[PDB]
Enzyme design. Structure first.
Site, PDB file in Angstrom:
ATOM      1  N   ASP A 146       8.275  -4.549   6.082  1.00 29.05           N
ATOM      2  CA  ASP A 146       6.961  -4.066   5.695  1.00 29.05           C
ATOM      3  C   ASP A 146       5.911  -5.194   5.631  1.00 29.05           C
ATOM      4  O   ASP A 146       5.121  -5.259   4.740  1.00 29.05           O
ATOM      5  CB  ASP A 146       7.053  -3.247   4.402  1.00 29.05           C
ATOM      6  N   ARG A 150      -1.488  -6.168   2.685  1.00 37.89           N
ATOM      7  CA  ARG A 150      -1.385  -5.426   1.419  1.00 37.89           C
ATOM      8  C   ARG A 150      -0.140  -5.852   0.610  1.00 37.89           C
ATOM      9  O   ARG A 150      -0.115  -5.668  -0.607  1.00 37.89           O
ATOM     10  CB  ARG A 150      -1.380  -3.905   1.667  1.00 37.89           C
ATOM     11  N   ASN A 151       0.885  -6.408   1.296  1.00 38.81           N
ATOM     12  CA  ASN A 151       2.122  -6.890   0.685  1.00 38.81           C
ATOM     13  C   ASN A 151       2.112  -8.398   0.437  1.00 38.81           C
ATOM     14  O   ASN A 151       3.049  -8.925  -0.161  1.00 38.81           O
ATOM     15  CB  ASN A 151       3.349  -6.444   1.482  1.00 38.81           C
ATOM     16  N   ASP A 164       6.774  -7.808  -1.494  1.00 38.88           N
ATOM     17  CA  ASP A 164       7.111  -6.439  -1.128  1.00 38.88           C
ATOM     18  C   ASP A 164       6.948  -5.642  -2.408  1.00 38.88           C
ATOM     19  O   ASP A 164       7.859  -5.602  -3.241  1.00 38.88           O
ATOM     20  CB  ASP A 164       8.540  -6.338  -0.552  1.00 38.88           C
TER      21      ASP A 164
END
Ligand SMILES: Nc1ncnc2scc(-c3ccc(NC(=O)Nc4cc(C(F)(F)F)ccc4F)cc3)c12
Length: 292
Positions: A146, A150-151, A164
Protein backbone atom coordinates in the site's frame (compact mmCIF):
# COMPACT_ATOMS: atom_id res chain seq x y z
CA UNK A 1 21.03 -4.86 15.53
CA UNK A 2 20.29 -8.42 16.76
CA UNK A 3 18.50 -7.04 19.92
CA UNK A 4 15.71 -5.57 17.68
CA UNK A 5 14.42 -9.17 17.05
CA UNK A 6 13.03 -9.16 20.65
CA UNK A 7 9.83 -7.14 21.30
CA UNK A 8 10.26 -4.30 23.85
CA UNK A 9 7.55 -4.43 26.55
CA UNK A 10 6.23 -1.15 28.03
CA UNK A 11 4.59 -0.74 31.49
CA UNK A 12 0.90 0.42 31.49
CA UNK A 13 1.47 3.37 33.92
CA UNK A 14 4.00 4.86 31.42
CA UNK A 15 1.26 5.35 28.74
CA UNK A 16 -1.04 8.41 29.18
CA UNK A 17 -3.88 8.37 26.56
CA UNK A 18 -4.76 11.93 25.34
CA UNK A 19 -6.90 11.96 22.13
CA UNK A 20 -8.82 9.29 20.16
CA UNK A 21 -7.32 9.73 16.63
CA UNK A 22 -9.65 7.22 14.93
CA UNK A 23 -10.63 3.57 14.38
CA UNK A 24 -8.78 0.85 12.46
CA UNK A 25 -9.02 -2.83 11.42
CA UNK A 26 -8.49 -4.38 14.91
CA UNK A 27 -9.32 -1.43 17.22
CA UNK A 28 -9.01 2.27 18.17
CA UNK A 29 -5.99 4.58 17.52
CA UNK A 30 -4.90 7.17 20.15
CA UNK A 31 -2.44 10.05 20.64
CA UNK A 32 -0.59 9.36 23.92
CA UNK A 33 2.39 10.32 26.13
CA UNK A 34 5.08 7.68 26.80
CA UNK A 35 7.38 8.02 29.85
CA UNK A 36 10.77 6.32 30.64
CA UNK A 37 11.16 5.13 27.01
CA UNK A 38 13.74 7.20 24.95
CA UNK A 39 8.63 12.05 27.79
CA UNK A 40 7.71 11.76 24.06
CA UNK A 41 4.43 11.88 22.07
CA UNK A 42 3.28 8.47 20.76
CA UNK A 43 0.67 7.10 18.31
CA UNK A 44 -0.90 4.03 19.98
CA UNK A 45 -3.12 1.23 18.56
CA UNK A 46 -5.46 -0.75 20.90
CA UNK A 47 -6.86 -4.34 20.88
CA UNK A 48 -9.89 -4.68 23.25
CA UNK A 49 -11.32 -8.07 24.47
CA UNK A 50 -9.90 -10.17 21.59
CA UNK A 51 -9.63 -13.97 21.01
CA UNK A 52 -6.47 -16.13 21.54
CA UNK A 53 -5.75 -16.13 17.75
CA UNK A 54 -6.27 -12.31 17.56
CA UNK A 55 -3.83 -11.80 20.51
CA UNK A 56 -1.47 -14.28 18.71
CA UNK A 57 -1.67 -12.04 15.55
CA UNK A 58 -0.96 -8.91 17.69
CA UNK A 59 2.28 -10.52 19.02
CA UNK A 60 3.12 -11.75 15.45
CA UNK A 61 2.66 -8.15 14.10
CA UNK A 62 4.81 -6.87 17.04
CA UNK A 63 7.53 -9.49 16.18
CA UNK A 64 7.54 -8.25 12.54
CA UNK A 65 7.65 -4.47 13.32
CA UNK A 66 10.28 -4.80 16.12
CA UNK A 67 12.95 -5.94 13.58
CA UNK A 68 11.73 -3.40 10.93
CA UNK A 69 13.95 -0.49 12.15
CA UNK A 70 15.22 2.26 9.79
CA UNK A 71 15.75 6.07 9.51
CA UNK A 72 12.83 6.34 7.00
CA UNK A 73 10.44 3.76 8.53
CA UNK A 74 7.96 4.95 11.23
CA UNK A 75 9.46 4.02 14.64
CA UNK A 76 7.78 1.09 16.45
CA UNK A 77 8.70 1.37 20.18
CA UNK A 78 6.96 -1.76 21.48
CA UNK A 79 3.83 -3.21 23.13
CA UNK A 80 1.90 -3.13 26.44
CA UNK A 81 0.23 -6.50 27.19
CA UNK A 82 -0.38 -5.80 30.93
CA UNK A 83 -4.18 -6.21 31.06
CA UNK A 84 -6.81 -5.15 28.50
CA UNK A 85 -6.68 -3.40 25.99
CA UNK A 86 -3.41 -4.54 24.33
CA UNK A 87 -1.42 -1.41 23.31
CA UNK A 88 0.89 -1.14 20.24
CA UNK A 89 3.35 1.83 20.53
CA UNK A 90 4.56 3.92 17.51
CA UNK A 91 6.11 7.43 17.30
CA UNK A 92 3.75 10.41 16.83
CA UNK A 93 4.52 12.40 13.67
CA UNK A 94 3.33 15.97 14.50
CA UNK A 95 3.03 17.10 10.84
CA UNK A 96 0.75 14.18 9.83
CA UNK A 97 0.54 12.27 6.52
CA UNK A 98 2.58 13.28 3.42
CA UNK A 99 -0.45 13.65 1.06
CA UNK A 100 -2.00 16.32 3.36
CA UNK A 101 1.46 18.01 3.55
CA UNK A 102 1.92 18.04 -0.29
CA UNK A 103 -1.61 19.52 -0.78
CA UNK A 104 -0.96 22.17 1.95
CA UNK A 105 2.14 23.35 -0.04
CA UNK A 106 0.48 23.27 -3.50
CA UNK A 107 -0.18 26.26 -5.85
CA UNK A 108 -3.93 26.18 -4.97
CA UNK A 109 -3.22 26.25 -1.16
CA UNK A 110 -0.85 29.28 -1.62
CA UNK A 111 -3.58 31.03 -3.70
CA UNK A 112 -6.52 30.16 -1.31
CA UNK A 113 -4.75 31.60 1.80
CA UNK A 114 0.22 32.07 3.33
CA UNK A 115 2.14 28.76 2.93
CA UNK A 116 5.25 28.35 0.73
CA UNK A 117 4.95 26.44 -2.57
CA UNK A 118 6.85 23.10 -2.38
CA UNK A 119 10.01 23.49 -4.52
CA UNK A 120 11.60 20.91 -6.90
CA UNK A 121 14.55 20.63 -4.41
CA UNK A 122 12.11 19.83 -1.53
CA UNK A 123 10.29 17.34 -3.84
CA UNK A 124 13.60 15.50 -4.56
CA UNK A 125 14.44 15.43 -0.79
CA UNK A 126 11.03 13.81 -0.01
CA UNK A 127 11.47 11.32 -2.95
CA UNK A 128 14.97 10.06 -1.91
CA UNK A 129 13.79 9.42 1.72
CA UNK A 130 10.85 7.17 0.60
CA UNK A 131 13.20 5.40 -1.90
CA UNK A 132 15.73 4.81 0.97
CA UNK A 133 12.98 3.32 3.18
CA UNK A 134 11.85 1.07 0.29
CA UNK A 135 15.49 -0.14 -0.21
CA UNK A 136 15.44 -1.22 3.49
CA UNK A 137 12.05 -3.03 3.17
CA UNK A 138 13.32 -4.94 0.06
CA UNK A 139 16.49 -6.00 2.00
CA UNK A 140 14.17 -7.36 4.78
CA UNK A 141 12.00 -9.16 2.12
CA UNK A 142 8.94 -7.09 3.16
CA UNK A 143 6.18 -6.29 0.63
CA UNK A 144 4.38 -3.15 1.71
CA UNK A 145 1.39 -3.49 -0.66
CA UNK A 146 0.00 0.00 0.00
CA UNK A 147 2.79 2.47 -0.82
CA UNK A 148 1.19 5.94 -1.27
CA UNK A 149 1.84 9.48 0.14
CA UNK A 150 -1.25 9.07 2.44
CA UNK A 151 0.72 6.22 4.17
CA UNK A 152 3.93 8.29 4.49
CA UNK A 153 4.50 10.59 7.49
CA UNK A 154 6.20 14.02 7.82
CA UNK A 155 8.39 14.86 10.83
CA UNK A 156 10.67 17.80 11.70
CA UNK A 157 13.02 19.44 9.09
CA UNK A 158 11.29 17.77 6.05
CA UNK A 159 11.93 14.24 7.50
CA UNK A 160 9.80 11.61 5.69
CA UNK A 161 9.06 8.05 6.96
CA UNK A 162 7.04 5.16 5.44
CA UNK A 163 4.12 3.71 7.41
CA UNK A 164 0.92 1.69 6.96
CA UNK A 165 -1.97 3.40 8.79
CA UNK A 166 -4.46 0.49 8.80
CA UNK A 167 -6.95 3.11 10.06
CA UNK A 168 -10.29 4.09 8.42
CA UNK A 169 -9.82 7.56 6.83
CA UNK A 170 -12.92 8.75 4.89
CA UNK A 171 -10.83 11.36 2.97
CA UNK A 172 -8.90 8.44 1.31
CA UNK A 173 -11.93 6.09 0.73
CA UNK A 174 -11.85 7.10 -3.00
CA UNK A 175 -8.24 5.73 -3.24
CA UNK A 176 -9.53 2.13 -2.81
CA UNK A 177 -11.59 -0.12 -5.13
CA UNK A 178 -13.40 -3.41 -4.34
CA UNK A 179 -11.41 -5.68 -6.73
CA UNK A 180 -13.60 -8.59 -7.90
CA UNK A 181 -16.13 -7.56 -5.24
CA UNK A 182 -13.86 -9.05 -2.52
CA UNK A 183 -10.84 -6.87 -1.56
CA UNK A 184 -10.49 -3.06 -1.14
CA UNK A 185 -7.28 -2.39 -3.13
CA UNK A 186 -5.38 0.84 -4.12
CA UNK A 187 -5.78 0.29 -7.93
CA UNK A 188 -4.36 3.74 -8.91
CA UNK A 189 -0.98 2.78 -7.29
CA UNK A 190 -1.11 -0.87 -8.50
CA UNK A 191 0.57 -2.62 -11.48
CA UNK A 192 -1.42 -4.94 -13.88
CA UNK A 193 -0.43 -8.25 -12.14
CA UNK A 194 -1.58 -6.94 -8.70
CA UNK A 195 -5.03 -5.80 -9.98
CA UNK A 196 -5.67 -8.85 -12.25
CA UNK A 197 -4.00 -11.68 -10.24
CA UNK A 198 -3.45 -10.17 -6.72
CA UNK A 199 0.35 -10.78 -6.98
CA UNK A 200 2.21 -8.45 -4.57
CA UNK A 201 6.04 -8.34 -4.74
CA UNK A 202 9.08 -5.95 -4.45
CA UNK A 203 8.42 -5.19 -8.18
CA UNK A 204 4.75 -4.24 -7.49
CA UNK A 205 6.04 -1.89 -4.73
CA UNK A 206 8.41 -0.33 -7.36
CA UNK A 207 5.36 0.51 -9.58
CA UNK A 208 3.73 2.14 -6.47
CA UNK A 209 6.92 4.22 -5.86
CA UNK A 210 6.72 5.57 -9.44
CA UNK A 211 3.13 6.67 -8.65
CA UNK A 212 4.37 8.12 -5.26
CA UNK A 213 6.98 10.14 -7.28
CA UNK A 214 4.09 11.36 -9.54
CA UNK A 215 2.13 12.41 -6.36
CA UNK A 216 5.13 14.39 -4.93
CA UNK A 217 5.71 16.32 -8.21
CA UNK A 218 1.92 17.04 -8.64
CA UNK A 219 1.52 18.45 -5.05
CA UNK A 220 -0.37 15.37 -3.76
CA UNK A 221 -3.00 15.17 -6.56
CA UNK A 222 -4.81 11.82 -7.02
CA UNK A 223 -3.25 9.75 -9.87
CA UNK A 224 -5.57 9.36 -12.93
CA UNK A 225 -7.98 11.95 -11.28
CA UNK A 226 -9.70 12.53 -14.68
CA UNK A 227 -10.67 8.79 -14.82
CA UNK A 228 -13.22 6.49 -13.15
CA UNK A 229 -11.98 3.23 -11.50
CA UNK A 230 -12.79 1.17 -14.68
CA UNK A 231 -10.87 3.64 -16.95
CA UNK A 232 -7.86 3.50 -14.52
CA UNK A 233 -7.55 -0.35 -14.86
CA UNK A 234 -8.03 -0.06 -18.69
CA UNK A 235 -5.09 2.45 -18.93
CA UNK A 236 -2.83 0.33 -16.61
CA UNK A 237 -3.61 -2.96 -18.47
CA UNK A 238 -3.42 -1.45 -22.02
CA UNK A 239 -0.11 0.37 -21.43
CA UNK A 240 -1.17 4.04 -21.04
CA UNK A 241 0.98 6.02 -18.55
CA UNK A 242 0.47 9.02 -16.19
CA UNK A 243 1.39 12.44 -17.68
CA UNK A 244 4.77 14.08 -16.93
CA UNK A 245 4.29 16.59 -14.02
CA UNK A 246 5.21 20.24 -14.89
CA UNK A 247 7.70 20.51 -11.95
CA UNK A 248 9.24 17.05 -12.64
CA UNK A 249 12.74 16.80 -14.27
CA UNK A 250 13.07 14.54 -17.38
CA UNK A 251 15.51 12.21 -15.49
CA UNK A 252 12.87 11.66 -12.71
CA UNK A 253 10.00 11.06 -15.22
CA UNK A 254 12.12 8.50 -17.16
CA UNK A 255 12.74 6.81 -13.76
CA UNK A 256 8.90 6.79 -13.20
CA UNK A 257 8.52 5.13 -16.68
CA UNK A 258 11.07 2.48 -15.58
CA UNK A 259 8.82 1.69 -12.56
CA UNK A 260 5.80 1.45 -14.93
CA UNK A 261 7.01 -1.51 -17.08
CA UNK A 262 4.24 -4.12 -17.79
CA UNK A 263 6.53 -7.08 -16.95
CA UNK A 264 7.38 -7.13 -13.18
CA UNK A 265 11.01 -8.24 -13.77
CA UNK A 266 11.58 -5.54 -16.46
CA UNK A 267 11.09 -2.76 -13.83
CA UNK A 268 14.00 -0.66 -12.47
CA UNK A 269 15.56 -2.02 -9.24
CA UNK A 270 14.94 -0.14 -5.93
CA UNK A 271 18.71 0.36 -5.25
CA UNK A 272 19.15 2.03 -8.67
CA UNK A 273 16.05 4.25 -8.12
CA UNK A 274 17.37 5.43 -4.69
CA UNK A 275 20.97 6.03 -5.98
CA UNK A 276 19.65 8.35 -8.76
CA UNK A 277 17.20 10.21 -6.43
CA UNK A 278 19.93 10.60 -3.71
CA UNK A 279 22.39 12.07 -6.31
CA UNK A 280 19.80 14.55 -7.72
CA UNK A 281 18.66 15.60 -4.19
CA UNK A 282 22.32 16.32 -3.22
CA UNK A 283 22.76 18.31 -6.51
CA UNK A 284 19.61 20.39 -5.63
CA UNK A 285 19.64 20.63 -1.77
CA UNK A 286 17.03 22.14 0.56
CA UNK A 287 17.85 25.54 2.03
CA UNK A 288 14.78 27.75 1.74
CA UNK A 289 12.34 28.51 4.56
CA UNK A 290 9.16 26.34 4.61
CA UNK A 291 5.92 27.95 5.90
CA UNK A 292 2.54 26.29 6.57
N1 LIG B 1 2.37 7.58 13.51
C1 LIG B 1 1.39 8.53 13.54
N2 LIG B 1 1.84 9.85 13.78
C2 LIG B 1 0.86 10.83 13.81
N3 LIG B 1 -0.52 10.68 13.67
C3 LIG B 1 -0.92 9.38 13.44
S1 LIG B 1 -2.55 8.93 13.22
C4 LIG B 1 -2.10 7.29 13.02
C5 LIG B 1 -0.78 7.06 13.12
C6 LIG B 1 -0.24 5.74 12.94
C7 LIG B 1 -0.36 4.67 13.87
C8 LIG B 1 0.21 3.40 13.56
C9 LIG B 1 0.91 3.21 12.31
N4 LIG B 1 1.47 1.92 12.03
C10 LIG B 1 2.37 1.52 11.00
O1 LIG B 1 2.82 2.26 10.16
N5 LIG B 1 2.69 0.14 11.04
C11 LIG B 1 3.23 -0.57 9.93
C12 LIG B 1 4.39 -0.12 9.22
C13 LIG B 1 4.88 -0.87 8.14
C14 LIG B 1 6.10 -0.38 7.38
F1 LIG B 1 7.27 -0.79 7.85
F2 LIG B 1 6.12 -0.72 6.10
F3 LIG B 1 6.20 0.96 7.37
C15 LIG B 1 4.25 -2.08 7.73
C16 LIG B 1 3.10 -2.56 8.43
C17 LIG B 1 2.59 -1.80 9.52
F4 LIG B 1 1.53 -2.23 10.17
C18 LIG B 1 1.02 4.32 11.38
C19 LIG B 1 0.46 5.57 11.70
C20 LIG B 1 -0.03 8.25 13.36
Amino acid sequence: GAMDTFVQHIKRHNIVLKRELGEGAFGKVFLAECYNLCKILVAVKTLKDASDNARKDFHREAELLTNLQHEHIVKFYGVCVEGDPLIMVFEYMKHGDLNKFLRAHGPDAVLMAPPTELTQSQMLHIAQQIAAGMVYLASQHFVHRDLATRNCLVGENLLVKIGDFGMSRDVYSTDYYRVGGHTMLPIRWMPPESIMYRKFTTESDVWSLGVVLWEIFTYGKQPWYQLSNNEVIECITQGRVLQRPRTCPQEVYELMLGCWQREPHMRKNIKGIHTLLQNLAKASPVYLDILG
